[PDB]
Structure formats: C-alpha cells, structure tokens
Amino acid sequence: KVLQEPTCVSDYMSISTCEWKMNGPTNCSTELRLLYQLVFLLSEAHTCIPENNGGAGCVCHLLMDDVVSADNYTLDLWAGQQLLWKGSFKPSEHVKPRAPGNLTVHTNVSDTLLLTWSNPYPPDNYLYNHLTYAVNIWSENDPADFRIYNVTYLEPSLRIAASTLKSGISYRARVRAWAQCYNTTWSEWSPSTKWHNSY
Amino acid sequence: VLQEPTCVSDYMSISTCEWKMNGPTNCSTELRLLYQLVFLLSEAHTCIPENNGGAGCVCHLLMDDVVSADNYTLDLWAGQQLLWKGSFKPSEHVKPRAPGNLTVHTNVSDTLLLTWSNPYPPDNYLYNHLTYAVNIWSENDPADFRIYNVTYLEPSLRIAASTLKSGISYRARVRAWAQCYNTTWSEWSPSTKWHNSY
Amino acid sequence: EVQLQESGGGLVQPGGSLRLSCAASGSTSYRYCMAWFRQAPGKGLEAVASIRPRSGRAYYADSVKGRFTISRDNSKNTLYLQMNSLRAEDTAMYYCAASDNDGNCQDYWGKGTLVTVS
Amino acid sequence: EVQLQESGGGLVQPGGSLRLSCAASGSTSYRYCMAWFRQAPGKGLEAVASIRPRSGRAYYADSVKGRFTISRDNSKNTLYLQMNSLRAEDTAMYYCAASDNDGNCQDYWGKGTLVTVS
Ligand SMILES: *[C@@H]1O[C@H](CO)[C@@H](O[C@@H]2O[C@H](CO)[C@@H](O[C@@H]3O[C@H](CO)[C@@H](O)[C@H](O)[C@@H]3O)[C@H](O)[C@H]2NC(C)=O)[C@H](O)[C@H]1NC(C)=O
Ligand SMILES: *[C@@H]1O[C@H](CO)[C@@H](O[C@@H]2O[C@H](CO)[C@@H](O[C@@H]3O[C@H](CO)[C@@H](O)[C@H](O)[C@@H]3O)[C@H](O)[C@H]2NC(C)=O)[C@H](O)[C@H]1NC(C)=O
Ligand SMILES: *[C@@H]1O[C@H](CO)[C@@H](O[C@@H]2O[C@H](CO)[C@@H](O)[C@H](O)[C@H]2NC(C)=O)[C@H](O)[C@H]1NC(C)=O
Ligand SMILES: *[C@@H]1O[C@H](CO)[C@@H](O[C@@H]2O[C@H](CO)[C@@H](O)[C@H](O)[C@H]2NC(C)=O)[C@H](O)[C@H]1NC(C)=O
Ligand SMILES: *[C@@H]1O[C@H](CO)[C@@H](O)[C@H](O)[C@H]1NC(C)=O
Ligand SMILES: *[C@@H]1O[C@H](CO)[C@@H](O)[C@H](O)[C@H]1NC(C)=O
Ligand SMILES: *[C@@H]1O[C@H](CO)[C@@H](O)[C@H](O)[C@H]1NC(C)=O
Ligand SMILES: *[C@@H]1O[C@H](CO)[C@@H](O)[C@H](O)[C@H]1NC(C)=O
C-alpha cells in the first residue's frame, strides 16, 4: 500500500513524470498501473506502466498530446482490480524543463574558452525562447575550485578567460536549464564534459 | 573509372553509391563525390568515400526527406581532374532498409511465431507498404529451406512446427520489398537460430 | 467573441455517408475545445465528437466510434464531421460548439444543420 | 492552380527588422519548392530564400545569409520571411512563389509587398 503520495512535474512538451513510494519491495511494471485522463469533453483514460526507482519506489512517464496552461488531469493508481489512490495534476503548476545536451568545450582559441550546447526544445515551444542556463565548471579532483555562470542571453554558448582556470589540470563542466515561466524548477544536469586545461 | 557509379536510396535520409576505379585507390584521400539537389538556391555537398575493395569505393549521401521529384547532379573529382559527371533520382532506385530484431517464439507447441521490426517510422511512405520475405533453413543443410512471403503489412509469421524436421536447428532471416515503383530487395536482417522440436 | 456557421446537412439513405462543416469567424487554433453535439426531436443535447485544435487529438462518444471522424483545417478556420455508416438513430439537428478557457465546449454555438436518414 | 497573397511590408530604418507572410490557398506541404524573390528599382528579379516545405530545409542567397530567415507553418498554409539587420540595399518589392513539378519556383506568384529602407 501507498506511503508517500504521487507527485508530478511536466516538461511542457509531451512528458509528465510522477513519483510515489510503497512499503517494502514492489515490482512496478507487473503489479501497478497509473491511469490518467484529461478533463475534457468525451475524454478517454490513458494507462501508464511504471518503472522502478529503488525497492518501494515507482516512476511513470505520462505521455501527453500537448501541454497548454489550462490542462488538468485526473490520476488513478490501481493495483490489479484494487484502486489505491485518486488524485489530480496540472502540468503548468509544476514545470521542470528538459536537461540540455551535447555540451562541448572548444580549445581552438588562446585566451578565450568557448562552451556550446543544445536547447532541448523545438523552436515552436514556449520555453525555447525562455530558457536560462547555469554552467558549472570544476577541477576534477577539487570541487572547491569551481565556477558558476548564469547565461540569460538566450543562446547556448559561454566564453571564459583561459587565465581563470589552472593549467596542467583537467576540468569538468555541466549545464542545466531554468524556465522564465511561473512555477518552474531547475532541469536535471546535462551529462558532463572533461578537458585538460593548459596554454 | 571502370564501371559507372550507381546509387540506391532508402527513401529517408541515406543514398548509397558504388563505383570501381582503375588501379589501387585510397578514396578517403584523393577522391571526392560532389552532389547537389537541383533546387532553387541549393548548395553542393561533398561526400568523402570509403573503400570497399582494392579499386572499389562507396559513398553515403546524406539527405533531407526523399520526394519523388528530387533529382541530384553527381560529380566525381580526383583533385583538379573531373572523372565522372552524372545524375541521380532517388525515387527511381529504392532499396529499403533491412528489418531488424528478428525473434522466434517457441512457447506454443504446435505453432512457431516469428516477429521483427519495420525499420521505418509510422510517417514514412514505406512504413505501410513493405512486403517481407522470410528465409528458413537447416543450419548444416541449406537445401532444406523455406521462403515465406508476408504481404499483410505486419512483421509477423506463423508456421506449424510439424512442417520442419525435429531434433534439428534452423536459421531464419528476413528482407524487405517496397512494392512502390523501382524498388529492389533490402539487405537481410541478422539471422536467428532455434532448435526445432514439437 | 467567436461566431460559428454550420453547413452540409440533408436527407440520406441508411448506410450512406455525409460531411458537415463549420466555419469560424476567428482562429480555430486559439480554441481549447471544439466539438459536434446533436439534438434529435424529443431528446436532449448529446456530445458526439470533440477535438484539440492544436494537436488534432480527437475524442468520440461510443455511439459514433468507428463511423464518425472529426477533423479541422486551421488555415480555413473550419471544423468537419465525416459521417459514415449512417443509421436511423443518427437523425438529429447537429451543432458545432467551442470554448477557450475550459474543455466543456459551451461558450460558442452554431445554428445547426438537420441530418435526416430515411 | 495555387493562389498566393503576401503581407507585412512597410518602411524601416537601416538596422531595423520586418516579418513578411504569404498565405496559400492550398496545402503548402504538397508544394515542391517555395521561395521569396525580390525586385529593386531598376533591377531584375532575384531569389532571396527558398524552402523544402515537408522537411523545412532552407536555402539562402549570400546577400541575406546571417540576416534573413525563411520558415513555414504547414498547419496555416503560410510562408514567412523574418528580415533582420535591414540595409538600404534591401529596398524592393518582395514576392512569394511556388512550384509543384520542379524546383525552379516559377509556376505561382503573389502580388508583392513593398519593403522600403531609408
Ligand atoms: C483539476 O481537477 C480536479 C478534479 O476534477 C480538481 O480537484 C477538485 O478540487 C475541489 C476543490 O479544489 C475538491 O473539492 C473539495 O473537497 C474537499 C474534500 O476532499 C472539501 O473539503 C472542499 O470543500 C471541496 O469540496 C474536489 O474534491 C477535487 N476533486 C478531485 C476528484 O480531486 C482540481 O481543482 C482541478 N483544477 C485545478 C487543480 O486547477
Ligand atoms: C507466448 O504465447 C502467448 C500465447 O500463449 C503469446 O504471447 C503474447 O504475445 C503478445 C505479442 O508479443 C503480447 O502482447 C502484449 O499484450 C498486452 C495486452 O495488454 C500489451 O502489453 C500489448 O498489447 C502487447 O502487445 C501478449 O501480451 C502475450 N501474452 C502472453 C501470454 O504473455 C505468444 O505466443 C508468446 N509470447 C510472446 C512474448 O510473444
Ligand atoms: C536530373 O538532372 C540532370 C542534370 O540537370 C539531367 O540530365 C540531363 O538530361 C538531359 C536529357 O535528359 C540532357 O541535358 C543531358 O542528358 C543531361 N545533362 C546534364 C547531366 O546536365 C537529368 O535528365 C535529370 N533527371 C531526370 C530524370 O529528370
Ligand atoms: C509476394 O507477394 C506479392 C503479391 O502481394 C507478389 O507480387 C506480385 O508478383 C507478380 C509476379 O512477379 C507480379 O505480376 C505482380 O505485379 C506482383 N504484385 C504485387 C502485389 O506487387 C510477389 O511476387 C510475391 N513474392 C514471392 C514470390 O514470394
Ligand atoms: C502556478 O501559477 C499560477 C499562475 O501563475 C497559479 O494560479 C497557480 O496556483 C500556481 N501554483 C500553485 C501556487 O500551486
Ligand atoms: C543532442 O544531439 C543529438 C544528436 O547529436 C540530438 O538528437 C539531440 O536533439 C540533442 N540533445 C539535446 C538534449 O539537445
Ligand atoms: C542566476 O539565475 C538563477 C535562475 O535564473 C537565479 O536563481 C540566481 O539567483 C541567479 N544568480 C545569482 C548569483 O543571483
Ligand atoms: C523507373 O525508372 C525509370 C527510369 O529508368 C523511370 O522512367 C520511371 O520512374 C520508372 N519506370 C519503371 C519502368 O518502373
């Protein structure tokens, strides 16, 4: 039976991610189902088969046609023929954007470093024009030697003076995204990249 | 050049061209294949070929979609020297992708079930228009074989186990045909093996 | 606010088909919900089919599932209802409706077109 | 028999921007080629930008590379030309054209919109 109550977030494209906790060991793909349905004329319930997140924890990725701000869903957690939980979810109240990707460092200019990466959204999504980024650089064996850069100029690039980083040392870098919308939290981190600094 | 460059198209994003030179040639240095869509404000793209024999080379032409009126000009250069001029129309030389993930299901005593994947996304033309040929044969005796034509637009096949010898292992592979016009057979899938019983 | 005008009704043979249309005086693409409802003489209104104008995702009442199709052409600001395998039961006045802030489809209504089957 | 109507022209300061539009009377997605051309006073027609409607693949003349963007919304049957960093040189009548059987873009033409830069 259910311990902690299902909570959801939305990427504001097509995927909403929900999380709950059972007691003890549970296999989510075989035992449980999460039914979701848009409050909308003649709507049908869709069904999401969850995957496991450690022992008593499940996660579901709710596929969605679209996300607009008035969209509201009802949520029904079943366990076979037994209904465990009823709830509701509004994607525009809980935005968590996608992680950026393809993070690349460019070595080809003395004095100035160039980092590039991709916006994970298509041009016609709202967030595409409204993403802030946070770029985190640190030396691989000394996390206290770090930098954080805020990128608000709506372009997935960053330039840094090479003299700000130690030579003969290797650095890591990762990037996350923030939506200028309301009710947003930070994305996950990109995969990180590594280079040896020196000039 | 001995035999002239010929091309085929998967009707998505890849066209593959083939020629055979004169003597020994390293294609990744020395040779370039320039292609360009006959289309307003188009730019010529450049394809660096890979070797596929002593004097034989292959190029994989990257493409946006493929629509039937698409025509390309093809120029094989060797430095400052132009070796061959031609043209290519993808819709006149369709060779679909090989199917994949071929699986035998032995969980029903009387009937075998083979499944496999259509290599196209639902929104391509070919996705709804692929015929398949399934080739089954005894692992050490190729002359004991079967061919099945699958035209019902679903990558599955069923056979009575009693139609194959017992105690013996069989292989199976599948290829795809577009119907379309100007199509040839795809490559074979990787093959699978099972021990036949009933 | 939006104005709506249906067309395409008439007499039909049981088994035969029909296509309805509904021009909108403004962008279909800015509507949240768009739907067809129907009356029938002695009876109350019932929703038949609905659509999400942006994505195109369509929904249907059981009685028309497999027979009716709802669609939209955003460039014409127009909504359609392809009606196949028509039965005597489908005899009614047919209406296009729409809404902007909720999926009830009750804000805007057309005048209706009769569909008689005999 | 496709028909095309441009809009969005006007006078601009050097450095400023503009957005042109071209509604089509039929599906943009069935066109082979779609493009913008222009004619400056005293001079001949020149292609500015072209597009593959299905995939979205876009092509440009050198003089507008880095400044102009061509795009299309197939759901509205509409073509766009975002014009940035405008110069006096860009002063012309601007046309949308299309073709179905060749990539020349010469079959169908719109009426044009003037774009003045001074
Ligand atoms: C999204 O959809 C859900 C379901 O349609 C909406 O939830 C509903 O919210 C109302 C009021 O916020 C709930 O009513 C309240 O119930 C409590 C006791 O449970 C009672 O003490 C209050 O006086 C009130 O009647 C209602 O139960 C609830 N429905 C369900 C099934 O969860 C939600 O508000 C919708 N819209 C959003 C979140 O913007
Ligand atoms: C083993 O034999 C059974 C019949 O005795 C057959 O298995 C069935 O295979 C299909 C397709 O591979 C499975 O489809 C799935 O159905 C569920 C329905 O909610 C859903 O996940 C999807 O619709 C999916 O297509 C089917 O469930 C499965 N049933 C069993 C008994 O596992 C087949 O001959 C052999 N099994 C397999 C894996 O092919
Ligand atoms: C594809 O384009 C090429 C080059 O634009 C066309 O090749 C020419 O064809 C005509 C007669 O068919 C003649 O000018 C020559 O034979 C070719 N000259 C070249 C290579 O420039 C080719 O016809 C086009 N293909 C099709 C089938 O439309
Ligand atoms: C597989 O089945 C198709 C029929 O669906 C066969 O295709 C026909 O082949 C004949 C003879 O070659 C042609 O005259 C027809 O035009 C083909 N029709 C279609 C549907 O394309 C095909 O030959 C079969 N292949 C085998 C031998 O298994
Ligand atoms: C999310 O923001 C909207 C408006 O910006 C607000 O109505 C809604 O209540 C917010 N979510 C909360 C505070 O639960
Ligand atoms: C990263 O690049 C891949 C291909 O290199 C592309 O498919 C994908 O959209 C990009 N990922 C993100 C998250 O931007
Ligand atoms: C950088 O931007 C983030 C979110 O956009 C904000 O929370 C943060 O406070 C900014 N940085 C600093 C140092 O204020
Ligand atoms: C296949 O290609 C030919 C050119 O050889 C072309 O005329 C037509 O598209 C097709 N014709 C046949 C016989 O299928």
Q: Which residue has the tokens 């977030």?
A: A9
CB contacts under 8 A, A 160-199 vs C, are none
The number of folded domains in chain D is: 1
Q: Answer whether residue D75 is part of any domain.
A: yes
Do A29 and A50 form a contact (C-beta atoms < 8 A)?
A: yes
- Same domain, residue pair A144 and A177: yes
Inside any domain, residue D112: no
Sole residue written with tokens 């709802």: C70
Mutate to test the interface with D, among B36, B37, B41 (most CBs of D within 10 A): B41
Same domain, A129 and A185: yes
Judge if A158 and A179 occupy the same domain.
yes
- For residue B26 the two structure tokens come to 């390293």
Residues in chain B: 198
CB-based contacts of A19, cutoff 8 Å, min separation 6: A6, A7, A8, A53, A57, A58, A59
Which of C17, C10, C26, C30 lies closest to C94, judged by CA? C10
Inter-chain touch D52–B65, beta carbons under 8 Å: yes
CA angle in degrees (0–180, nearest 5) for A149-A152-A156? 80
Q: Classify burial at A24, counting beta carbons within 10 Å of its beta carbon; exposed 0-12, middle 13-18, buried 19 or more.
A: exposed
Element of type H or E holding A28: helix A28-31
Same domain, B13 and B82: yes
The domain that holds A53 is classified in CATH as 2.60.40.10
Q: What is the dihedral of CA B20, B23, B26, B28, to 10 degrees?
A: -40
Which DSSP state fits A191? P
User: Rounded CA gap, B158 and B139, in Å?
Assistant: 20
Looking at chain A, how many residues does it have? 199
- Residue A38 distance to chain C (closest CA, Å): 9
Residue B198's alpha-carbon distances to B102, B111, B147, in angstroms, are 21, 9, 21
Whole-angstrom Cα distance, residue D35 to residue D48?
7
Query: What element of type H or E holds A31?
Result: helix A28-31
> Domain check: are B122 and B164 in the same one?
yes
Technique used: X-ray
* Three-state secondary-structure class, residue D53: coil
Q: Do residues A70 and A130 both lie within one domain?
A: no
The two structure tokens encoding residue B144: 């004991």
Helix-strand-coil percent breakdown of chain D, rounded to 5? 10, 50, 45
Nearest C-alpha neighbor of D32 from the set D108, D106, D101, D110:
D101
Nearest Cα to C34, choosing from C44, C45, C21? C21
Please list, in sequence order, all residues whose beta carbon lies within 8 angstroms of the beta carbon of residue C32, skipping any fewer than 6 positions away: A68, A70, C52, C53, C99, C100, C101, C102, C103
What's the domain count of chain B? Answer: 2
Asked if residue C95 is part of any domain, the answer here is yes
Name the closest-CA residue to atom 3, ligand 6: A102
CB-based burial of residue B163 (10 Å sphere; 0-12 exposed, 13-18 middle, 19+ buried)?
Answer: exposed
Q: Identify the H or E element spanning A29.
A: helix A28-31
Q: Which of these, A124, A82, A108, A80, lies nearest to A195 by C-alpha position?
A: A108
In a domain, C12, yes or no: yes
C near D: at least 3 beta-carbon pairs less than 8 Å apart:
yes
Q: Which of A102, A121, A127 to mutate to test the pocket of ligand 6 (most atoms within 8 A of CB)?
A: A102
- Hey, what amino acid is at B96? P
Q: Which among D55, D59, D101 has the least Cβ separation from residue B40?
A: D59
* A45 touching chain C per CB within 8 A: no
Task: With CB atoms and an 8 Å threshold, state whether A40 touches C59.
Answer: yes
CA distances from C46 to B66, C60, C61, C62 (A): 45, 11, 9, 12
Cα separation, A114 vs A195, in Å, equals 12
Is C118 among the domain residues? no
The DSSP call for residue B84 is E
* CATH at D77: 2.60.40.10
Last residue of a domain, one of B25, B60, B92: B92
B107/B179 same-domain check: yes
Q: Are residues B191 and B105 in the same domain?
A: yes
Residue pointed to by tokens 């000394």:
A142
Which helix (H) or strand (E) segment holds residue A30: the answer is helix A28-31
End-to-end CA, chain C = 38
Q: Which residues, 6 or more positions from D23, have their beta carbon under 8 angstroms from its beta carbon?
A: C75, D4, D5, D7, D76, D77, D78
Residues B112 and B174 in one domain: yes
Q: Which amino acid is at B24?
A: P
CB B164 within 8 A of CB B136: yes
C113, two tokens: 């077109």
Transcribe A3-50 into DSSP letters.
-EEEEEEE-SSSEEEEEEE-SS---HHHHEEEEEEESSTT---EEE--
The SS3 of residue B186 is: coil
Residues whose CB falls within 8 Å of the CB of residue B48, separated by 6 or more in sequence, listed in order? B27, B28, B32, B33, B59
Closest protein CA for atom 7 of ligand 8: B92
In this structure, are strands D10-12 and D113-117 parallel, antiparallel, or unpaired? parallel
Bridge-based pairing of strands C18-24 and C4-7 is antiparallel
Contact D113, D25 (CB under 8 A): no
Domain boundary among B92, B121, B151: B92
C-beta separation of C27 from C42 below 8 A: no
Q: Is residue D11 part of a domain?
A: yes
Residue D106 lies in a domain: no
Q: Are A117 and A177 in the same domain?
A: yes
Strand order from edge to edge, sheet including A193-196: A142-151, A131-139, A170-179, A193-196
- Cβ neighbors of A124 (< 8 A, separation 6 or more) are none
* Domain enclosing residue B87, as ranges: 3-92
Residues A119, A72 within the same domain: no
Query: How is residue A119 written in tokens?
Result: 């916006």
Q: CA-CA-CA-CA torsion for B101, B104, B108, B111, nearest 10 degrees?
A: 110
Cα distance between residue D22 and residue D4, in whole Å: 6
Q: Are D83 and D74 in contact (CB under 8 A)?
A: no
CB < 8 Å from A in window 10-69 of C: 32-33, 35, 47, 49-50, 52, 54-55, 57, 59-61
Residue B127 CA to ligand 3 center (angstroms) comes to: 31
Does any domain span residue C112? no
Gaps in chain D after residue (C–N beyond 2.5 Å): none
**CB < 8 Å & 24+ apart, contacts of A28-31:** A28/A52, A28/A58, A28/A59, A31/A79, A31/A80
Same domain, B186 and B106: yes
Of the candidates C102, C117, C115, the residue with the CA atom closest to the CA atom of residue C37: C115
Q: Select from B49, B66, B92 the last residue of a domain.
A: B92
